[PDB]
Amino acid sequence: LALSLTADQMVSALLDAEPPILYSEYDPTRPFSEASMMGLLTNLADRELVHMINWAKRVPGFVDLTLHDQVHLLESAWLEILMIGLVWRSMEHPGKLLFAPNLLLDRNQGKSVEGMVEIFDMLLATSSRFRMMNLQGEEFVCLKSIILLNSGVYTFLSSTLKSLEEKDHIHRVLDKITDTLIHLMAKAGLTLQQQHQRLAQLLLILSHIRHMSNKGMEHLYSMKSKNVVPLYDLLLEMLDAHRLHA
């Protein structure tokens, strides 16, 4: 059970669950100004989503939830999760965003699309903040898991017995991850005061990531009019897998 795991077990579980870093899909031997910037990012995001679902399934406690609740959590968090991942891998590239190892973009390369330069600036600022705090890999995987579990937990539709039990489980797992973050900081030499200060600093950054996701979704919604399968149904199909391959 997830609630039985120790701090070091939680960390190992999260580190092991980490998804791969994907590459942008474009011909390296052709003029760049030819390729659609938003086309490249959309394709990347869509491929990453598949791996995000595998990752979520390996976050302790996640698969203990109902399918419906798992979908709701990912539907609310997916863009924040993409964004915190980007910021993490951009940390050692000041002034640039490492969307993919073969797609490193600077501020001015977002002007091709509306609202993009503003979001790029916010993402760059978050990466600067992490660099400045010297964020560690173990801390990063805790934060990404907190995002998955927290972002949609205040927007649950139901209030049935089952929903109450679901929320309680989510909050117990979140408490576990808080314990894990504190543990990592204790093992890195920080005093108690430094521990709760750093915890608060990290969790306050999650509000900015929420803000970035909201602003991004504003523009994506003006932009995404494919009139096709709703994200919920797409997430469900991917999450609701058989065990005929297991």
Place this chain on the structure above:
Amino acid sequence: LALSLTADQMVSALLDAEPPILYSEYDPTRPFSEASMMGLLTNLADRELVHMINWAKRVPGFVDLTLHDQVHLLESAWLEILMIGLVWRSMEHPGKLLFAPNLLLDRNQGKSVEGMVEIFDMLLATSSRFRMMNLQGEEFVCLKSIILLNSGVYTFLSSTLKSLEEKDHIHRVLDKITDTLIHLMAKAGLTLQQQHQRLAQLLLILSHIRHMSNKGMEHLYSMKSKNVVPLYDLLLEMLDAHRLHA
């Protein structure tokens, strides 16, 4: 200086700075269905803003910032601050939002305006969460101050020496407030583990408040087309006061 204050001094400073509870402005002796719901809330919000500025000025550390930075912080946080205040005074009114003592509204009374019922539901859910956590007045005033200082701090435009010093000051004050929250929880009997768990639970709610503010601003922006003085300039005029009354 704010950075010199003790936990109990911080708490007393914040409690003393608390703004008044205002009343909705409408004739109690006339048909309700006559009054504009959005008209009543807008008028209330506009009057509260004036008192919010006095409050901000009394938050330790705030007036140490440049006028420009003070404005930026309030411009980014004002709706979150209105919302957390509402949720706080609605805490003991399950199912209802106490916008004012003479304006207690339930879910169904938001349907008059677009997007409103959704925001009402999110606000009600936040109030339920606070009730459920048994949020205390001392904790509430810390959270509202954290919102003021944090919401706009990742969106500072400049990177001058002065801006670096401003950000450092804001983060030191935020650390002070974290210490104060932990102190209050220590003095309420919570164990160390319970302390960092409750701190994280409270700060994660701030992400939902950010989300609510974003969604609210989406609809207010479709709705506010007064073509008049920009909020920044209005905030500046109110913040940039002479000391001819002091």
